[PDB]
């Protein structure tokens, strides 16, 4: 999944 967060990966 594409992570937009560095501290926490959230699928965009």
For residue 10 the two structure tokens come to 């959230």
The length of the chain, given as a count of residues: 12
Separation of alpha carbons 2 and 10, rounded Å: 7
Q: What is the DSSP letter of 2?
A: -
Beta bridge partners of residue 11, listed in sequence order:
3
Separation of alpha carbons 4 and 11, rounded Å: 7
Q: Which technique was the structure solved with, according to the deposited record? A: NMR
For residue 9 the two structure tokens come to 């990966």
Q: Which residues of 1-12 are buried (b: 16+ CB within 10 A; e: fewer)?
A: eeeeeeeeeeee
């Amino acid at each position: 999944s594409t992570c937009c967060g560095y501290r926490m990966c959230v699928p965009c």
